[PDB]
């Protein structure tokens, strides 16, 4: 069995909306600790990894670890046909079968019981985030979104360069170029606007613009995006939730030069 | 007249009594009537017998028809429109209208009418199956034929398929097998003459003797509708007075084909082939089926007496070859010109 | 700025009309037209000139590529002190953007010309526009319709430049604007220019090879200039000792049009024993591959309208035509199988051989008349237009006829002619009462009566018998029909 | 519930490594030496259906990276869309970035690339060579004419010859080891001759004759069981029918044909092929005999491919054989 | 885990002198590069002769260190519609760049035969107007697929197939640089199976070298699979039907070749059979096409090819 009753309804909707049009097929693993998930992109370039503990759930009951594979399109179709004022409950039987999403209003009796037939995704559970990163930083989501969607209009590649107390986003295209250089500084009146940086070696590496534009869609969840960069390692873009976290593992674009 | 004097039941069919008895046998237990396929010569009276059996099994109110318009859409934006002849007990389709989109029309409309049921008051919904009539089934496309054959057994307690067609050969073996095959022989001269006698005593036309009706029956080659129509045209032109000396009114295209055969047998040259191509263009451009043109041309060529045995034999061989080639192509003139060139090379 | 970096085609471009080699008459006519455009505008363009040129507001330039069309159109506007407005294929041209950008510049004045020169009285037309529409052929993005509509509501000299005139898309330009034809120049016009270039570049050119240079590149002088420039970097002596390699390596592979492809594939010179190795079968198939949309239709149109020269001993013309038509039918079968389902496109060269190459080779000779245009494209459209009317009539009469759309045309219409038309001939205007009681039976109208008569062929031709009955019964029948209610 | 024994024999015995790929020794050896030396150019496997191409490339992908091959290796079979808009975005982005797990060259397997449009191959023609020092392409195909000459030239051509008798025999022995079963030598020869190189038909008819034993632990699969499972005509009555057609008259030949084709429910399409294979060995002392013998039989086979009749075609085969065996006298 | 570059890429010439193709055109390009006044040019020829590498070495030698910002190459992978050719190509054409005196900006439009006609139409004037700063260079495989004006503005430069001498010279260079044991027979066999294709020749060389070490006739004829069209050309010219049938059975059918490929190759070979006459060629092509139509409906057994060969022999013998 598996019973997960959320506190609200739009929580799961906003959670799925982070990687709605980024990945197609996911596989949630439910255990006594909470719901974990990791899914590879269609082009096998970035990986979405979500961890939500038992803190966001109003009620949680899971006896044995269960795996539930499903596509995101039908899942979003099911979440869209539910009113944002109900209470959501995920239900799974003994053996992994069609997952039951149940919407129950708090005032009038409205039982909306939808079924979702599982896909048979190969359980290649991956173990990353144990690699020591060379550089770590954290900065407000609004600034990152602004910078990236301003630099995306000039090219399709973006070079991130972390040097001695300097962060540099460089876009180089056909019509022109652009360079945004920021420095670490912390404010006492507004602790959320501070940009933090802890480096060990200067790191310069490139990424694509489409993947960054798809990643920054997750800025609606949190306000302080963390970025972990390392040579010969996937870049980690982390959004911190109130119970877990949503992390994108992006692959850097190598340079022919 | 053609449309006026037509039987509207099984006790009124006045020719081919064996087929009428067989239809009455098939009209005894309606709830066990399988799918039907009528085959025979053109203008034999297949649709009238179909609608008569349909009236015998249902109520007499099946003859009141109404035309409706249905709009379908293909994979692309090209919207197609079809006409459906519906009645409170059946519906008639002519799927041959759409060029190569018959597979959509069949698999859509037949499925739509098969899933749901019929409700009408004339004890609110309980009724028997619904009948679908398909005119010119021989022109159905192979994929459309496969769809129609598959939508037969899945939903059998709701749809009964009664198809009619002449020259049953372009019907795939599965459809030929999973349905009953009923042949409609053309009426004999002694019966079409009686039909003409009833028409002339009912319409009050002035005829001298019975030889005129015999000549009309002999000229029509057995076709009842064409014989009735030619009789009416002769009565119209002869000013309400049929005499023993009246020129048989051949349709205009028959006269064109006869002049074409004369031009062929007289002058065997490429210069005549150019005028032949012009005549074939003028004939095809005015909505004439190419297979009918080929059949009439070949039979009129064999009618020519100045040709010996070997010429007619090679002519019929080339006609069979180009008729095989005609059912596997789209540009019909491309085959008709070749057949004319071959018969010209054969004659000399 | 630099003088050597130039592409040998801009440093030597004609800077005056007396340097455009070839077609003196055409450029002279165009110059006179642009000069008398103002005088013809004074007469509202309703007075034809000596050559009948003042009745046209817009000019059209067409001819083979690389002859000086754009050069002439620029120099003729620069010489008369006008201002040049030039739009080309790189600019986005569509009815919306055309009515947006250049429609305002159709009847306005120049803003830059007012500051150019106004102190001295050079000419009164130094403040007006001459809009040069170059490369009208390329309209992949209101390309020809709106531009043709510009030819009537214009107020400034409108010069249009294209490459091929008889293309079907640009037909509206037929009689709405004056057109002139620029021909491929001979070897006598460009010879002086080429010798003067050879003098000014320190490299030898024999006056005997220039004709071969013009022959290998049919009518593109720019191609000759580029050929000379490319070879003058390592070899400065171009004479009869190496002209063969140049003429063989720098041939022009132009695309052939439906007329030329038929004229070439129907010539009895290629299929001879000598021509078979000078123009191989691979080239013959490539000739089809240039245009696989009109070549089979052209061949089927004019395969028996020629006098062959490859007739085998014993075989006459009729037998060759019969074999050609048999192969035409086989190619038609192959084409239907190609354009059917499963999208079998790997079967194209078989169609190329069956439809085009074999019937051509069978009746290959010397063509008697001219290359006739294909007739099946119009006949199929007419057949479709007639089938629509037949379907309409059949679905109108379906309530009473109880017959397919085929059995009605072959049988019913002969008697319907006797019933409907004949009373109007033998009885006159008093049979109007009877005829109507027929059509209301079959739910027909005046539109169906207009269409039914057009179907008969052979001895019964109604399009001439209709003009025989009086016009008063024609005017009374429609009134009687419109008055009464169904 | 789900286990390895539920899979059909077509997939249950899929070669895991390269060592379990028999027959194509001269290609497996070269591929192993490629991966051992460290260099692996763009490969293009070309072979008849059911030879070992996909199995070989999957075993290679497993050997190169690890037991998790479908992690850093991209695979575009005929089930995914492979238009120009796909080779533009997906393949290029996969070939322009690094791996996520380890540090090595990336592998892209375009399986059945013969089903790609010409524009897609023309677009791939440059991206296949622009990024060479990071990714490698493997093009699997069955029809070597669908590929454009350019893409065909950029890849090293490896042909997968049909499985010889020894390879199929070794595989049959290995299958009979794991599954308790016994198979007759003449049955083995008949199965080899019926295989026609297809390794899948072998396992299919083997599972069939194993199921048709009623006790697949003691009784041996004789030739009759194999001939019955696929309904193929035994050489005995085939040669009997051929002899009766060649020697006897019309009535008795038609009678014996209708008696043989109705004793086991044979098909004329298989009888034609069997008679052709048996009669190709004869020494006809003229060239005009074989011409008609092949032309008429091919026409009859093409007509059978449309299913016109069933007895008219049999008498047509009889007449074609008899009329072809007449110029000899 | 380091993967060595292939012999086709590791030894790709980076200098215009290392090109072993057509001597005259390569010398012309060399003189143009030393001078600098490079005009628009179309390079077309058989697949795998060195057109792209030639134009790339030309650009690298003409611009040197400015190659990063002076050349804009658009391949078939990148978009080449009307939008891009109108916006990006134009913006790069007017891009003000300070180059050495006798140099120019270059645009490498590879695979020109794949572009739409409208793209070339829009490109005509964009190329003609800014000739003082932009010099386009097209490199395709079929010059007929390019529209006439674009082809006429530029100076055409045809490319012929590589003769056996050039291929053997480059092969000897590669062997000398790679220290491989070889024999003359192996190199002759490689050249014979290369059908005049530098890339295919080098790939087959690397394959046989890594597979057996010694480049001998046995190894190459073992793992190179001598070209298809030659066997089919040998099959269609047999004297008696039995020899051609035996060739089809042993060399084509038994070696695992699909019937559709054999039919297509036979058609393509008969298309260029200069020995026999024209009428016999047309009749053979018609029969091969009938067999092709029979194959495409699904029935593709050996009997169909046998009957096709029988019909070709009946046609050629009488
Ligand atoms: N009669 C001529 N005399 C001298 N130079 C000429 C002549 N015709 C063309 N040219 C040269 O050709 C170039 C001008 O090209 P044009 O012929 O004007 O192109 P076009 O006529 O517009 O044909 P398109 O637009 O390419 S189809 C310049 O280098 C001119 O010097
Ligand atoms: N060389 C071989 N050795 C052993 N088993 C083989 C061999 N080739 C094929 N098989 C068997 O056939 C099955 C399918 O082979 P595949 O390699 O997938 O066929 P294929 O090469 O992909 O040809 P296609 O894709 O159908 S055209 C394998 O799982 C094996 O059971
Ligand atoms: N003349 C040559 N001399 C030396 N190497 C050559 C020569 N021609 C081709 N190559 C080799 O072929 C490869 C580059 O060829 P490409 O330029 O890609 O051929 P191509 O002319 O572009 O024809 P495509 O584009 O494949 S249809 C490199 O590995 C070169 O070493
Ligand atoms: N038993 C009959 N008695 C009188 N007329 C008949 C009879 N059977 C057929 N007809 C005539 O046949 C005509 C209809 O022919 P129809 O059924 O449309 O031919 P088809 O079967 O080819 O569609 C009617 O006008 C009708 O007069
Ligand atoms: Mg121009
Ligand atoms: Mg495979
Ligand atoms: Mg290239």
Author numbering:
A (entry chain F): 1 to 257
B (entry chain E): 4 to 125, 129 to 354
C (entry chain A): 291 to 431, 435 to 779
D (entry chain C): 7 to 335
E (entry chain B): 5 to 322
Manuscript text:
To our knowledge, these are the first high-resolution structures of a clamp loader bound to an open clamp prior to DNA binding. Both reconstructions are highly similar (overall Cα RMSD is 0.74 Å, map to map correlation coefficient is ~0.85) and we refer to these structures as Open1 and Open2. PCNA forms a right-handed spiral with a ~20 Å opening that is wide enough for dsDNA to enter. PCNA opens at the A-gate of RFC, disrupting the interaction between the first and third subunits of the PCNA ring (termed PCNA-I and PCNA-III, hereafter). The open PCNA ring is directly held by all five subunits of RFC, burying ~3800 Å2 of surface area, an approximate ~1860 Å2 increase over that of the Autoinhibited states. The AAA+ modules of RFC adopt a right-handed spiral whose periodicity matches that of the six contact sites on PCNA. In order to rupture the PCNA ring, the AAA+ spiral of RFC widens, opening the A-gate. The RFC-E subunit uses its E-plug to bind PCNA, which pulls the A′ domain and E-plug up to 45 Å away from the AAA+ module. This reveals a large opening of the A-gate (at its most narrow, the A-gate is approximately 20 Å wide). p/t-DNA can therefore directly enter the open RFC:PCNA complex. The Open1 and 2 states represent the stable intermediate state in which PCNA is opened but DNA has yet to bind.
Sliding clamps are ring-shaped protein complexes that are integral to the DNA replication machinery of all life. Sliding clamps are opened and installed onto DNA by clamp loader AAA+ ATPase complexes. In contrast to typical AAA+ ATPases, clamp loaders are heteropentameric with the five different subunits called A–E.
